Each structure stands twice: as C-alpha cells, then as structure tokens.
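ok posting inputs for the R-warfarin job
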Amino acid sequence: SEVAHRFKDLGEENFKALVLIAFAQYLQQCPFEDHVKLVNEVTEFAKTCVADESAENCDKSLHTLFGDKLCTVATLRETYGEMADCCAKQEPERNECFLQHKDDNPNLPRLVRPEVDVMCTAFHDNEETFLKKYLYEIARRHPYFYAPELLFFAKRYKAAFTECCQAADKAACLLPKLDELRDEGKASSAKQRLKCASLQKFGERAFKAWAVARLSQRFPKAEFAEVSKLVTDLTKVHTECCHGDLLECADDRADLAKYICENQDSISSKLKECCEKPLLEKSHCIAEVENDEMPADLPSLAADFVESKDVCKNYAEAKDVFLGMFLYEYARRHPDYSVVLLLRLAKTYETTLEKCCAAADPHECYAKVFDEFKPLVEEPQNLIKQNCELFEQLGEYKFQNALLVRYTKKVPQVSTPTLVEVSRNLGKVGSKCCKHPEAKRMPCAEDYLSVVLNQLCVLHEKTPVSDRVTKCCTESLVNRRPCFSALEVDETYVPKEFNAETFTFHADICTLSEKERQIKKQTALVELVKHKPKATKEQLKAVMDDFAAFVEKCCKADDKETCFAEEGKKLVAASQAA
Ligand SMILES: CC(=O)C[C@H](c1ccccc1)c1c(O)c2ccccc2oc1=O
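and the output
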C-alpha cells in the first residue's frame, strides 16, 4: 500500500492538507465543501489501510484512488463539462487528462476579505476550517503552487491571526502581514510555474542545467559530484510536484532537506541557521539561503576548458558530464551572472565544441571561444543599466506605462488584460532590482524577467493569437527574454476599430481603490495603442493626462452618473480627433 506509506511519513495533518491542495488544484471550480467531503472519505480509507495493508484497494496507486474519487463529481459535465471525458479514460493517462486541464487563469471571482472583526471571530471559532479554506482558495487559483511550500505559508498565515487577533488594533497588526504574504505567495507561485513549464515543455535535461547553474552559485564550495547529487534529487521532487504527485513530492522534499543538513559541511556554511528549526521552516530556509562565499584560490576556466588539448576528447567521452562540469565551474565563480546568462554561455560553448571538434585542428578552432562570451555578457548588463536609469527618472507607474506601450506594439494580438498584468509585473522589476549594486543586479533583474515572461507564455498558450509570441516562447527557454527584446512593432497588425463600450468610463470606477484606477487607466492606454499602433509616445501622453482629468472630475460631480454617459461619448469624439 502506498496511501499508507505516505500517511505514516506525513502524518494526519499534512497528509490531509496535501490531499486537499491536490484536489483543489485539479477541480478548481468545485465548491469548498465537496472537496472537504472527498478529502475526508479519502482520509478515512487511508486509516484502514494503515491497519490492514490489503483491505479494500489499499494495494493500488494513489492516482487510481484519487482519480476515481474526483470522478464521483466530475461526471457532472453540467458543472464540469470537458471533465467527464477525463473520467471515461483509463489508468495510463486518465491523469494526464486532468493535468492537461488545469486553468492558469480561472474565471474565479476576485477574493475580497471581510473586516478584521469577522476573520478573527471565524478563525477563533473554528480554526482547521479557517485554514482549510485558505489552502483551498490559493491552491485553486494557483494550480502549480509548490505544494510543500504552500503548507509553510499556511503555518505562517496561522501565526498572523494567532498573534494579531489578540492585539490592541487587529486591523493594524494583520492587514500588513497579510499584505506581505499575498505578494510573497504570488512571487513563489510564479517562480514555480516556470519550473513546471521547463520540465513539461523543455524536458528534464533543461531543468537539470538550470539547477546545476543555480545551485553551483549558491554552493561554490560544493563539489561537482555533490551538486549533481542535489540536482538529481531536486529534479525528481519538482518532477513529482508538477505531475501532481503531491504526497511523494512532499516526502522526497523532506528527505532532501534531511540530507542537506546532515552533510552541511560538505555543501554550504550558511546552512547552520536553517538546520536548527522545524521541518517546514528548515525547507523554506534552505531554498532561500544566500550563496556561500567563493573559494579562495580558484584556477582559471581557460585552463581545462579551452587551453587543454584534451577538450574534444573529454567532450566525446561524456559530453553531458563535461558540459555539466563547465557550467558548474563557470557558475560557481560568477554569482554576478543571471542563471539564464550562464545557460546562454554554456550553450554557446557546446555549439562551438560541436563544429570545432570535427575540424582539421580543433584547438585552433575553439581557441577564442571566450571572445564570443563578451557580447552575451554585456547585452544584459547594458539592458539593465539602461532600464534602471529610466525607472529612476519616471518612477514605477510611468515606467510601467512605458513598457505597456512598448509591449503592445510588439504583440498587438495579445489580450489587453494579459498585456496589462504582464507589463505591470515587468515594471515591478525596477523597484525590485534597480536599487542593487551592479554586482547583484543582473541575476536579480534578468531572472525575474524569465518568470514574468513565462506567464505571458503560459497565459498565451491557452488562446494563441500571435505567432510571434508563440515563436519567442517555444523556440528556446534560455533565449525568451532576448527574443522579445528583439521584437520591435508588428508591421502586419491591422489596427482595431473603436467600440463605444470599450472606452466608456462610468462612475462605478469611482468606488474602486487607487490601484484599480491606474489599472483602468492602463487598460485604456493599451486599447489606444491597439487602435493606433503607429501612434507616438507623444500623443499618448497628452491623452493620458486628459483621462486623469475626466476621473478626478466626474467622480466629484453631483449629477446622476450621467456625466460618464454623456461626457463618455464626448471624450470619444476628442480622442478620434488625435
Ligand atoms: C524556489 C527555490 O529556490 C527552491 C529550490 C530550488 C532550486 C533549484 C531548482 C528548483 C528548486 C530548492 C528546493 O525546491 C528544495 C526542495 C527540497 C529540499 C531542498 C530544496 O532546496 C532548494 O534550494
């Protein structure tokens, strides 16, 4: 029995949480209640298997069990139409079906939060149910959220209320901590969505390389044979978490933190503090630990990678191991490089050895390889230096607008919402990274952009409308950012034709938070650029200034919300004029 296996390892609490998440991530639409029922029915069953390891079907594979359980409600196509099909499938892939149907942008209602007075009550009254609801609301909106980590956020979420509800001003003590979590969780999910994408779209060889480079930077003192160990395991964890095998993901994940702490001295010296706390906190700590200092006297790469005359031979013997080693070596001594840049170099090298080793005199051929790294390394550096200057002058809002205009001209087919979400995120890179010394900027900035661009890539893949986005996304993982930077403006895009409804501002917007207004302002700027691609950043500006005037105005006018209706068609007349 497997269900028993995992139960003993995780225990009741976690076993129950992980299975809730899994269910929530599979049927994002179904109501809180139903999941709980199934989770319980499933948990009880487990409790019998522990005793009699051959009872009913305790001999099966988690999936069969998990799958049939969901299929007791999925067959209701009136609720989940395209799902009933999944249930009519077999064992080899009734699962794939489900995986293939997760929605990255669920049509789930915004999640507003009641006054602090209610939350505390509800929290205090019933706790487990309070935290279950949390997990359910997150896991269903983030179908790829790194499960094991979600538990960490939960324990954290719990302590927020547990302490704030006993304050002198709950609202003051909670709100903040809750805000700080909302963000961190959105960050964490993105980082993970990229991981799953790599594995799923590009294969594990690609995920491995990413890991080798990243880990080699974090643990410069670690040895190639050690890192590989770590990378091999790590991959498996994530391979599981992303395929939806949450339990084993959580198990293996723990075993890895166990290992890493045991062999502390062999890996990093900043692991101490991490290995002195609760599992959940230990794991989350290791994953976010600062790179170790760089080993003192280190040979030059050129030594064994360009000058040696046995290069091509070694390449032939174990090309995978060889390149792995090159990456590990170049990474460990370059924490100032973004993981994708390292990966870009690594690919440039491989490509070179390929053409070069089949030459009349390899050495002569691959002797100037580092000469090609120069361009690759400066490209991001300049990009960053540039974009941080602009950011520093315009401020975050203005900077986002800039990127809003810029991207919409790039890929005009893309849906306004996505363009808005993505450009907003892209601009957050300014505040996030620009305040860093060049030494930490590039890793900060360019890796952050691979995460953001991956949203656009996944969001897009749902309803593909621009081959340009498709090309850039599917072509090469490591090169996406460069690929998009390359794009200027779509010369084939046929401008849109105004729609009364699209540019009619009402008073309803006068109740929304400040943020939700800039957003309404931005969603406007996008629709403009789509109607006037060849327009300039000059015209656009003056206009944005105008729309600001409209809101500040009507939102302070006493007429029925009619201004917005009559003046709404009035501004439309002015706009078309420009
Ligand atoms: C978001 C992260 O940086 C997690 C990190 C990682 C690093 C490279 C590729 C994938 C993930 C990470 C883990 O996911 C992990 C899981 C179990 C035990 C130890 C771990 O350590 C870690 O650094």
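notes: The chain has six domains: 1-103, 104-193, 201-292, 293-378, 379-490, 491-568. Residues 191, 195, 211, 214, 234, 237-238, 253, 256-257, 260, 283, 286-287 surround R-warfarin (CB under 6 Å).
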